[PDB]
Short mmCIF file of C-alpha atoms in Angstrom, two decimals:
data_model
loop_
_atom_site.label_atom_id
_atom_site.label_comp_id
_atom_site.label_asym_id
_atom_site.label_seq_id
_atom_site.Cartn_x
_atom_site.Cartn_y
_atom_site.Cartn_z
CA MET M 1 0.21 -17.86 -6.69
CA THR M 2 -3.52 -17.14 -6.70
CA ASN M 3 -5.23 -14.04 -8.14
CA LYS M 4 -5.31 -12.40 -4.72
CA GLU M 5 -1.61 -13.23 -4.43
CA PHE M 6 -0.76 -11.86 -7.88
CA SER M 7 -2.49 -8.62 -6.90
CA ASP M 8 -0.99 -8.30 -3.41
CA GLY M 9 2.51 -9.20 -4.57
CA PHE M 10 2.20 -6.89 -7.56
CA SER M 11 1.28 -4.01 -5.24
CA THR M 12 4.11 -4.88 -2.86
CA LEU M 13 6.64 -4.90 -5.69
CA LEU M 14 5.32 -1.57 -7.01
CA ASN M 15 5.39 0.04 -3.52
CA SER M 16 1.77 1.13 -3.84
CA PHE M 17 0.59 3.67 -1.25
CA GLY M 18 4.07 3.82 0.28
CA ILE M 19 5.58 7.10 1.38
CA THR M 20 8.03 7.37 -1.54
CA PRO M 21 6.87 8.16 -5.08
CA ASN M 22 5.29 5.05 -6.53
CA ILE M 23 2.70 3.67 -8.95
CA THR M 24 -0.80 2.31 -8.29
CA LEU M 25 -2.72 0.17 -10.80
CA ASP M 26 -6.32 -0.98 -11.03
CA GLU M 27 -7.07 -4.68 -11.19
CA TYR M 28 -7.87 -4.36 -14.89
CA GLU M 29 -4.49 -2.70 -15.45
CA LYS M 30 -2.84 -5.40 -13.35
CA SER M 31 -4.58 -8.08 -15.42
CA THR M 32 -3.53 -6.41 -18.67
CA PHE M 33 0.12 -6.28 -17.67
CA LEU M 34 0.09 -9.80 -16.19
CA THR M 35 -1.41 -11.27 -19.36
CA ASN M 36 0.95 -9.30 -21.61
CA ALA M 37 3.93 -10.45 -19.55
CA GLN M 38 2.65 -14.03 -19.62
CA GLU M 39 2.30 -14.11 -23.40
CA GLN M 40 5.58 -12.28 -24.07
CA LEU M 41 7.45 -14.57 -21.70
CA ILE M 42 6.11 -17.81 -23.13
CA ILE M 43 6.65 -16.73 -26.75
CA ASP M 44 10.22 -15.71 -25.90
CA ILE M 45 10.72 -19.00 -24.05
CA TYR M 46 9.35 -21.08 -26.92
CA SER M 47 11.53 -19.31 -29.48
CA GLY M 48 14.49 -19.25 -27.10
CA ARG M 49 14.97 -15.49 -27.50
CA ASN M 50 14.93 -14.79 -23.75
CA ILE M 51 18.48 -13.89 -22.73
CA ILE M 52 17.90 -14.95 -19.12
CA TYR M 53 16.91 -18.53 -19.99
CA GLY M 54 18.39 -18.71 -23.48
CA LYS M 55 16.67 -22.05 -24.09
CA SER M 56 13.90 -23.18 -26.43
CA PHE M 57 10.55 -24.93 -26.00
CA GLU M 58 11.78 -28.21 -24.45
CA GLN M 59 15.52 -27.75 -24.38
CA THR M 60 15.87 -28.21 -20.60
CA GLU M 61 13.86 -29.41 -17.61
CA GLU M 62 13.25 -25.80 -16.54
CA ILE M 63 11.52 -24.86 -19.80
CA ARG M 64 9.61 -28.15 -19.77
CA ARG M 65 8.29 -27.41 -16.29
CA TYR M 66 7.40 -23.88 -17.40
CA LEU M 67 5.42 -24.60 -20.58
CA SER M 68 4.17 -28.11 -19.72
CA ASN M 69 0.60 -26.93 -19.14
CA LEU M 70 0.11 -25.44 -22.63
CA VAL M 71 0.86 -28.69 -24.48
CA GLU M 72 -2.38 -30.01 -25.97
CA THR M 73 -2.91 -33.01 -28.24
CA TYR M 74 -5.39 -32.99 -31.12
CA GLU M 75 -6.81 -35.63 -33.44
CA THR M 76 -9.04 -35.25 -36.49
CA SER M 77 -10.37 -37.32 -39.38
CA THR M 78 -12.62 -34.78 -41.13
CA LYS M 79 -11.31 -33.21 -44.33
CA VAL M 80 -12.39 -29.85 -45.72
CA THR M 81 -13.78 -30.54 -49.17
CA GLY M 82 -13.87 -27.55 -51.49
CA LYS M 83 -10.51 -25.78 -51.49
CA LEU M 84 -7.81 -25.06 -54.07
CA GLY M 85 -4.46 -26.74 -53.46
CA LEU M 86 -1.05 -27.04 -55.07
CA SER M 87 -1.53 -30.70 -56.00
CA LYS M 88 -4.20 -33.21 -56.93
CA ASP M 89 -3.39 -35.29 -53.83
CA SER M 90 -3.94 -32.48 -51.32
CA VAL M 91 -6.28 -32.78 -48.33
CA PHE M 92 -7.17 -29.95 -45.95
CA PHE M 93 -7.66 -30.31 -42.19
CA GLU M 94 -8.90 -27.63 -39.81
CA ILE M 95 -6.65 -26.40 -37.02
CA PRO M 96 -8.13 -26.29 -33.47
CA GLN M 97 -8.13 -22.43 -33.72
CA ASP M 98 -6.64 -22.11 -30.21
CA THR M 99 -3.27 -23.25 -31.54
CA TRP M 100 -0.25 -21.04 -31.05
CA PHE M 101 2.64 -23.17 -32.36
CA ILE M 102 2.52 -26.75 -33.65
CA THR M 103 5.30 -28.81 -32.06
CA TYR M 104 4.44 -32.41 -33.00
CA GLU M 105 2.41 -33.31 -36.07
CA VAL M 106 1.94 -36.78 -37.55
CA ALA M 107 -0.45 -38.43 -40.01
CA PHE M 108 -1.84 -41.96 -40.27
CA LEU M 109 -2.32 -43.33 -43.78
CA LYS M 110 -5.02 -45.74 -44.97
CA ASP M 111 -4.40 -46.99 -48.50
CA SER M 112 -4.43 -50.39 -50.17
CA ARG M 113 -1.46 -49.56 -52.42
CA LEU M 114 0.91 -49.77 -49.44
CA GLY M 115 0.15 -53.41 -48.76
CA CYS M 116 0.63 -54.87 -45.22
CA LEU M 117 1.88 -51.43 -44.06
CA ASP M 118 -1.67 -50.07 -43.79
CA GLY M 119 -2.26 -47.56 -41.05
CA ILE M 120 1.37 -46.46 -41.20
CA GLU M 121 2.11 -43.47 -39.03
CA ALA M 122 3.75 -40.92 -41.33
CA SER M 123 5.84 -37.89 -40.37
CA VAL M 124 4.22 -34.60 -41.37
CA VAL M 125 7.02 -32.31 -42.58
CA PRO M 126 6.34 -28.54 -42.78
CA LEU M 127 7.69 -27.55 -46.18
CA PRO M 128 8.20 -24.01 -47.55
CA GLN M 129 6.72 -23.01 -50.88
CA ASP M 130 10.15 -22.62 -52.47
CA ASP M 131 10.85 -26.26 -51.73
CA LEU M 132 7.49 -27.63 -52.87
CA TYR M 133 7.99 -28.04 -56.61
CA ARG M 134 11.39 -29.70 -56.31
CA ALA M 135 10.07 -31.83 -53.42
CA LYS M 136 7.06 -33.34 -55.18
CA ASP M 137 9.44 -35.47 -57.26
CA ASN M 138 12.08 -35.89 -54.55
CA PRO M 139 12.32 -39.57 -53.46
CA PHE M 140 14.25 -38.74 -50.25
CA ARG M 141 12.49 -35.57 -49.02
CA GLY M 142 9.14 -35.72 -50.84
CA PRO M 143 5.82 -37.33 -49.96
CA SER M 144 6.02 -41.08 -49.44
CA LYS M 145 4.64 -43.84 -47.22
CA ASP M 146 6.66 -42.42 -44.30
CA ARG M 147 6.47 -38.68 -44.99
CA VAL M 148 3.78 -36.05 -45.63
CA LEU M 149 4.24 -32.39 -46.54
CA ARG M 150 2.14 -29.80 -44.68
CA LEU M 151 1.57 -26.26 -45.96
CA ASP M 152 -0.19 -23.47 -44.08
CA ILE M 153 -3.02 -21.72 -45.93
CA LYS M 154 -5.78 -19.21 -45.22
CA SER M 155 -8.60 -19.83 -42.72
CA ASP M 156 -6.54 -21.81 -40.16
CA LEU M 157 -5.90 -24.82 -42.39
CA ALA M 158 -3.25 -27.46 -43.06
CA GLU M 159 -2.86 -28.65 -46.66
CA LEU M 160 -1.38 -32.15 -46.42
CA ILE M 161 0.31 -33.32 -49.62
CA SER M 162 0.65 -37.10 -49.59
CA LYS M 163 1.22 -39.86 -52.11
CA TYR M 164 -1.17 -42.17 -50.23
CA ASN M 165 -4.58 -41.53 -48.74
CA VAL M 166 -4.52 -39.68 -45.41
CA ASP M 167 -7.02 -41.08 -42.91
CA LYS M 168 -6.18 -39.42 -39.59
CA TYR M 169 -4.22 -36.32 -38.61
CA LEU M 170 -2.63 -36.07 -35.16
CA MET M 171 -1.14 -32.93 -33.62
CA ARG M 172 0.45 -31.70 -30.41
CA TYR M 173 0.67 -27.93 -30.13
CA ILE M 174 1.06 -25.05 -27.70
CA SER M 175 -2.32 -23.61 -26.75
CA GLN M 176 -3.58 -20.10 -26.14
CA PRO M 177 -2.96 -19.70 -22.39
CA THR M 178 -5.82 -18.56 -20.23
CA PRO M 179 -5.45 -14.84 -19.44
CA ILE M 180 -4.62 -13.72 -15.91
CA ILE M 181 -7.79 -11.89 -14.82
CA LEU M 182 -7.78 -10.87 -11.17
CA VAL M 183 -11.38 -9.60 -10.94
CA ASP M 184 -14.74 -10.10 -12.61
CA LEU M 185 -14.45 -7.34 -15.19
CA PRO M 186 -17.44 -5.02 -15.81
CA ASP M 187 -19.65 -5.33 -18.86
CA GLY M 188 -17.79 -4.79 -22.12
CA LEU M 189 -14.33 -5.38 -20.70
CA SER M 190 -12.48 -8.65 -21.24
CA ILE M 191 -8.99 -10.00 -21.83
CA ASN M 192 -8.67 -12.55 -24.66
CA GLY M 193 -12.46 -12.64 -24.77
CA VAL M 194 -12.73 -13.57 -21.07
CA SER M 195 -14.59 -11.33 -18.62
CA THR M 196 -14.56 -13.47 -15.47
CA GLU M 197 -11.61 -14.39 -13.26
CA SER M 198 -8.96 -16.51 -14.96
CA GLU M 199 -6.06 -18.05 -13.07
CA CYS M 200 -2.70 -18.80 -14.63
CA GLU M 201 -2.58 -22.45 -15.71
CA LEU M 202 1.23 -22.63 -15.86
CA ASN M 203 3.21 -23.84 -12.86
CA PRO M 204 3.82 -21.58 -9.84
CA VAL M 205 7.55 -21.62 -10.65
CA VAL M 206 7.12 -19.09 -13.47
CA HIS M 207 4.41 -17.02 -11.77
CA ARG M 208 7.00 -14.89 -9.99
CA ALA M 209 8.90 -14.26 -13.22
CA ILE M 210 5.59 -13.25 -14.81
CA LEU M 211 5.00 -10.89 -11.89
CA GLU M 212 8.44 -9.31 -12.31
CA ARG M 213 7.93 -8.85 -16.05
CA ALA M 214 4.48 -7.35 -15.45
CA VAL M 215 5.90 -4.88 -12.93
CA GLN M 216 8.57 -3.83 -15.43
CA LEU M 217 5.93 -3.39 -18.13
CA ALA M 218 3.86 -1.24 -15.77
CA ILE M 219 6.84 1.01 -15.03
CA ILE M 220 7.46 1.26 -18.78
CA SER M 221 3.82 2.18 -19.43
CA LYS M 222 3.80 4.95 -16.81
CA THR M 223 7.33 6.24 -17.55
CA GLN M 224 7.76 6.21 -21.33
CA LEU M 225 7.21 9.96 -21.88
CA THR M 226 8.87 11.40 -18.76
CA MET C 1 8.30 32.16 44.23
CA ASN C 2 5.04 31.77 46.14
CA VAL C 3 1.81 33.55 45.25
CA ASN C 4 2.51 36.56 47.48
CA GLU C 5 5.77 37.07 45.59
CA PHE C 6 3.99 36.73 42.23
CA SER C 7 1.60 39.47 43.27
CA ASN C 8 4.15 41.78 44.90
CA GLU C 9 6.53 41.68 41.94
CA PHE C 10 3.56 42.02 39.61
CA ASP C 11 2.77 45.28 41.38
CA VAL C 12 6.43 46.30 41.23
CA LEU C 13 6.71 45.62 37.50
CA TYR C 14 3.28 47.02 36.58
CA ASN C 15 2.57 50.37 38.27
CA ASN C 16 4.83 51.01 41.29
CA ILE C 17 7.66 52.42 39.14
CA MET C 18 5.72 53.71 36.13
CA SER C 19 5.81 57.50 36.04
CA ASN C 20 2.13 58.31 35.44
CA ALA C 21 1.16 55.26 37.45
CA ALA C 22 -1.97 53.36 36.46
CA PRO C 23 -4.64 51.94 38.76
CA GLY C 24 -3.50 48.89 40.66
CA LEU C 25 -4.90 45.58 39.48
CA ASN C 26 -7.32 43.62 41.61
CA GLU C 27 -6.29 40.15 42.73
CA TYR C 28 -8.82 38.41 40.50
CA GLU C 29 -7.41 40.26 37.49
CA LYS C 30 -3.84 39.35 38.46
CA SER C 31 -4.80 35.70 38.92
CA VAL C 32 -6.60 35.65 35.55
CA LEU C 33 -3.65 37.23 33.74
CA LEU C 34 -1.16 34.94 35.49
CA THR C 35 -3.12 31.84 34.47
CA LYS C 36 -3.36 33.14 30.91
CA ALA C 37 0.38 33.88 30.84
CA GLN C 38 1.11 30.42 32.22
CA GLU C 39 -0.88 28.68 29.50
CA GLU C 40 0.57 30.94 26.80
CA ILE C 41 4.12 30.22 28.00
CA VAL C 42 3.50 26.46 28.07
CA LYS C 43 2.12 26.48 24.53
CA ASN C 44 4.92 28.77 23.29
CA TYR C 45 7.67 26.59 24.77
CA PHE C 46 6.21 23.23 23.74
CA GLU C 47 6.27 24.25 20.08
CA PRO C 48 9.58 25.40 18.49
CA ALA C 49 7.94 27.87 16.10
CA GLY C 50 6.16 29.52 19.04
CA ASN C 51 9.31 30.99 20.61
CA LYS C 52 12.22 32.99 19.24
CA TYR C 53 14.70 30.16 19.83
CA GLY C 54 12.96 27.65 17.60
CA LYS C 55 13.28 25.13 20.44
CA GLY C 56 10.45 22.86 21.58
CA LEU C 57 9.98 20.43 24.43
CA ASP C 58 13.40 18.72 24.53
CA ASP C 59 15.60 20.79 22.20
CA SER C 60 17.80 22.15 25.02
CA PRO C 61 18.40 21.64 28.76
CA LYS C 62 16.23 24.64 29.61
CA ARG C 63 13.25 23.29 27.66
CA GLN C 64 13.56 19.94 29.42
CA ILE C 65 13.68 21.54 32.85
CA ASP C 66 10.74 23.82 31.96
CA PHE C 67 8.24 20.98 31.51
CA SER C 68 10.03 18.61 33.90
CA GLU C 69 7.61 19.47 36.72
CA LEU C 70 4.60 19.20 34.38
CA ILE C 71 5.25 15.70 32.97
CA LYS C 72 3.09 12.85 34.23
CA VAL C 73 2.75 9.13 33.50
CA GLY C 74 -0.63 7.42 33.66
CA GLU C 75 -2.69 4.70 32.00
CA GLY C 76 -5.62 4.56 29.64
CA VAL C 77 -8.66 2.75 31.02
CA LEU C 78 -10.25 0.17 28.73
CA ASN C 79 -13.58 1.55 27.50
CA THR C 80 -15.72 -1.58 27.84
CA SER C 81 -17.93 0.22 30.36
CA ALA C 82 -20.55 0.96 27.68
CA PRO C 83 -21.01 0.04 24.01
CA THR C 84 -19.81 2.35 21.25
CA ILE C 85 -19.21 2.55 17.51
CA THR C 86 -15.54 2.30 16.52
CA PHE C 87 -14.33 3.42 13.11
CA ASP C 88 -12.08 0.35 12.88
CA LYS C 89 -13.55 -3.06 13.64
CA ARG C 90 -10.27 -4.26 15.17
CA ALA C 91 -9.53 -1.34 17.51
CA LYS C 92 -9.80 -1.27 21.31
CA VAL C 93 -11.14 1.94 22.86
CA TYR C 94 -9.26 3.47 25.81
CA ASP C 95 -9.90 6.61 27.87
CA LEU C 96 -7.03 8.97 28.62
CA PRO C 97 -6.63 10.78 31.96
CA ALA C 98 -8.90 13.77 32.44
CA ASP C 99 -6.04 16.16 33.31
CA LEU C 100 -4.31 15.69 29.95
CA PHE C 101 -2.78 18.67 28.13
CA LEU C 102 -0.51 17.08 25.51
CA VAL C 103 0.55 13.50 24.73
CA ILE C 104 4.28 13.15 24.09
CA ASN C 105 4.87 9.41 24.48
CA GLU C 106 2.60 6.37 24.35
CA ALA C 107 3.34 2.67 24.61
CA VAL C 108 1.23 -0.47 24.84
CA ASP C 109 2.29 -3.72 26.51
CA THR C 110 0.83 -6.74 24.71
CA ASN C 111 1.45 -10.48 24.91
CA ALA C 112 3.99 -9.96 22.09
CA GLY C 113 5.98 -7.33 24.02
CA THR C 114 5.91 -3.58 24.39
CA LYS C 115 5.10 -1.48 21.32
CA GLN C 116 5.40 2.24 20.69
CA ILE C 117 2.11 3.82 19.66
CA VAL C 118 2.41 5.96 16.53
CA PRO C 119 -0.37 8.57 16.20
CA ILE C 120 -1.36 8.23 12.55
CA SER C 121 -3.04 11.07 10.67
CA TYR C 122 -6.33 10.65 8.84
CA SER C 123 -4.64 10.89 5.43
CA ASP C 124 -1.95 8.59 6.78
CA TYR C 125 -4.70 6.23 7.95
CA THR C 126 -6.27 6.18 4.49
CA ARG C 127 -2.90 5.51 2.84
CA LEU C 128 -2.09 2.69 5.27
CA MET C 129 -5.52 1.06 4.92
CA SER C 130 -5.31 1.13 1.13
CA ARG C 131 -2.38 -1.29 1.44
CA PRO C 132 -2.74 -5.10 1.54
CA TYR C 133 -1.37 -5.60 5.07
CA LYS C 134 -3.06 -2.86 7.16
CA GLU C 135 -1.14 -3.42 10.41
CA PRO C 136 1.73 -1.64 12.19
CA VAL C 137 5.41 -2.40 11.82
CA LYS C 138 6.91 -4.93 14.23
CA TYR C 139 7.58 -2.89 17.39
CA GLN C 140 4.79 -0.34 16.99
CA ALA C 141 1.05 0.13 17.34
CA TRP C 142 -1.34 2.57 15.67
CA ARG C 143 -3.69 5.05 17.30
CA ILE C 144 -6.52 7.36 16.31
CA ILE C 145 -8.82 9.54 18.38
CA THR C 146 -12.45 8.39 18.35
CA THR C 147 -15.72 9.75 19.74
CA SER C 148 -14.78 11.58 22.96
CA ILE C 149 -17.10 12.95 25.66
CA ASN C 150 -15.69 14.77 28.71
CA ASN C 151 -12.27 13.14 28.13
CA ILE C 152 -10.23 11.87 25.18
CA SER C 153 -11.17 8.39 23.98
CA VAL C 154 -8.59 6.61 21.85
CA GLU C 155 -8.66 3.60 19.50
CA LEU C 156 -5.60 1.34 19.67
CA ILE C 157 -4.92 -0.82 16.61
CA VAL C 158 -2.41 -3.63 17.14
CA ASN C 159 -1.40 -6.58 15.01
CA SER C 160 -3.71 -9.56 14.67
CA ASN C 161 -3.90 -12.16 17.45
CA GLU C 162 -2.58 -9.72 20.07
CA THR C 163 -4.14 -8.60 23.35
CA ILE C 164 -3.33 -5.40 25.22
CA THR C 165 -2.41 -5.71 28.91
CA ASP C 166 -1.89 -2.03 29.74
CA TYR C 167 -1.67 1.28 27.89
CA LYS C 168 0.73 3.82 29.40
CA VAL C 169 0.64 7.50 28.43
CA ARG C 170 3.48 9.89 29.22
CA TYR C 171 1.78 13.29 28.87
CA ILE C 172 1.96 16.88 30.08
CA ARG C 173 -0.36 17.54 33.00
CA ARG C 174 -2.80 20.41 32.71
CA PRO C 175 -1.25 23.32 34.67
CA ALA C 176 -3.07 24.38 37.80
CA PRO C 177 -4.11 28.05 37.98
CA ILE C 178 -2.14 30.69 39.85
CA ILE C 179 -4.49 32.29 42.38
CA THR C 180 -3.01 34.88 44.70
CA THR C 181 -5.73 35.00 47.37
CA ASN C 182 -8.82 33.09 48.40
CA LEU C 183 -11.36 34.24 45.82
CA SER C 184 -14.30 33.48 48.11
CA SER C 185 -16.60 36.48 48.50
CA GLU C 186 -20.02 37.22 49.95
CA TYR C 187 -21.09 38.83 46.67
CA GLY C 188 -20.24 35.74 44.62
CA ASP C 189 -17.47 33.16 44.41
CA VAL C 190 -15.31 33.71 41.32
CA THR C 191 -13.04 30.93 40.05
CA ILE C 192 -10.16 30.76 37.58
CA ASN C 193 -10.50 27.09 36.55
CA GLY C 194 -13.16 25.93 38.98
CA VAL C 195 -11.10 26.64 42.12
CA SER C 196 -11.38 29.68 44.41
CA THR C 197 -8.71 28.73 46.96
CA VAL C 198 -5.11 29.90 46.78
CA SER C 199 -3.19 27.95 44.13
CA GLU C 200 0.58 28.03 43.81
CA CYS C 201 2.35 27.75 40.46
CA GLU C 202 2.99 24.01 40.19
CA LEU C 203 5.78 24.30 37.59
CA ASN C 204 9.50 24.71 38.03
CA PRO C 205 10.76 28.00 39.53
CA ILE C 206 12.81 28.48 36.34
CA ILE C 207 9.85 29.95 34.39
CA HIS C 208 8.12 31.88 37.19
CA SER C 209 9.85 35.09 36.12
CA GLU C 210 8.81 34.39 32.53
CA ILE C 211 5.18 33.91 33.57
CA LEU C 212 5.36 37.17 35.51
CA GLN C 213 6.79 39.10 32.56
CA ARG C 214 4.13 37.71 30.23
CA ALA C 215 1.39 38.58 32.72
CA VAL C 216 2.66 42.16 32.97
CA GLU C 217 2.77 42.45 29.17
CA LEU C 218 -0.82 41.20 28.95
CA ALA C 219 -1.86 43.66 31.67
CA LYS C 220 -0.35 46.56 29.75
CA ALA C 221 -1.97 45.42 26.49
CA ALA C 222 -5.30 45.31 28.32
CA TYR C 223 -4.61 48.80 29.68
CA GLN C 224 -3.80 50.13 26.21
CA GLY C 225 -6.99 48.48 25.02
CA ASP C 226 -6.99 49.24 21.31
CA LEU C 227 -7.46 46.65 18.59
CA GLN C 228 -3.79 46.84 17.63
CA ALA C 229 -2.20 45.62 20.88
CA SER C 230 -4.86 42.95 21.33
CA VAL C 231 -4.15 41.62 17.84
CA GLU C 232 -0.34 41.45 18.13
CA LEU C 233 -0.35 40.08 21.68
CA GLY C 234 -2.97 37.53 20.68
CA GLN C 235 -0.49 36.10 18.21
CA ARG C 236 1.48 34.45 21.02
CA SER C 237 -1.58 32.70 22.47
CA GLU C 238 -1.16 30.01 19.79
#
C-alpha cells in the first residue's frame, strides 16, 4: 500500500466522517500511529512475543517475508584506538549506528601465528560479563582461532576479544526502518528525524497488519481516559 | 363544489346566520381569502407537525387522497443553454418545472440504471466530501440546489463515468387560485396569482369544505382585526 492508500484505508477503518460516532486523525497523527505500530510490530516479531504470530526473527517463511527488507550487511576494518577494555587483546569496532539488533556477526583473522589458516573466518560470540573471566582461559568456549568474544560498550561499540589479530569485522543486522510519513511535514516536525514523505520499505503483506495495529493504537489514544 | 358553491356557502357560514350580521364580503376578498386558505391547508397537511393529527403527505388514506389531485410528474431540462458556475466540478445542472411547489420524489436514469436522488444537506455535503470516496451509494444519486433564476436549478452528482439520460421529478403542482367571478373591471383588472378569469379549485373535493372553513376563519380574524387574532391565526400559515 502507498501513502495515499495507508491514509484512505486508515480513514475507512476508523469510519471518519461517517454518521455514527467516530474518530478523525490528521496526517501527522496517522503517521505517528503508523510508525509506532510498525516499530512495535517488528520488535515483537523479532523477539517472538507477538501472540498472533508467535514466531521469532526467521523462524518461518512468513516472518522472513515480513522482516526481509530490514536485513542489512556491514563490513569494517577500522579499529577505534584509544579505549579501555577488559583485556590486552581487545579491539573496538564502531557499529553502523542505524543498527537495531545484530543477527549475524563474524570476524576474519589475519595473524602469522595461525600458520596456513590465515584469513580464517571466526565466529563472533556475544558473551556476558559474568562469563568473561572464566571464558578467557576456557579452551572450548573462549577466544581461539575459530571463536571471538564480543562485548557491548558505550558509544555504539563492539569490543572484540581475540587470541589472534582481528583484521575484518562482518555483520548482518536489523536496520532502523524508514518511518511511515504520509505528508511533507511542516517545519520543525519530523518522525525519526525525517520530515518528508517516507514509504514503508517492508513488504505489502504486513502493511495491512500495520494498519490494523495503528487503528487500534489510535482508538487507545483517544479512549484511554473515557 | 364549483366556485358559485364556494361563494354561496362562504356567505352562509360568514354573515347570513350571524346575529349582528357583518358586511358581506366582496368577491375579490373571498377569492383572496380562499386562495390563502388553500395554500395554508396544503402546507399544513404536507407537514405532520402542521396539523393536529401529526400526519403528513402519506401517513393515512385521507392525506394521500388530499394531494392525489395535486401530484405531477415531469422532467428536468438539462441546463446547457448558457454557461454557469457550478459548486461541484462534476455536477450536471438541470432546471425543474416552473409550476413546482414541493419535490417528493426524484430519480435519474443513467447508463448504469435508474438511481434515486437523495437531497443532501449542506452540512451533509461537507461531511460526505471530507471522505475519500465522495460519490453516492450504488443505487442513488446526490443533489443540491444551485444558482436559480425564475425557476429552481439543480446540480445532479452521479458516480464517475456515468451519463444521465433523463431526470424525472415527482412533485406537487402549485395550486391554482380559487376565483369566484371574472375579476375584469373597467376601473382596473385585479388578479389573485396573475389570472382574472374564473378559476375552479383544482384539488380533490375532499378538502373543499376544509378550505371553506379556513377561509371563513381568516375572514373573521380580519374582521376582528386586532394584533392578537392576526398573530395566532398567522401561526398556521407555516
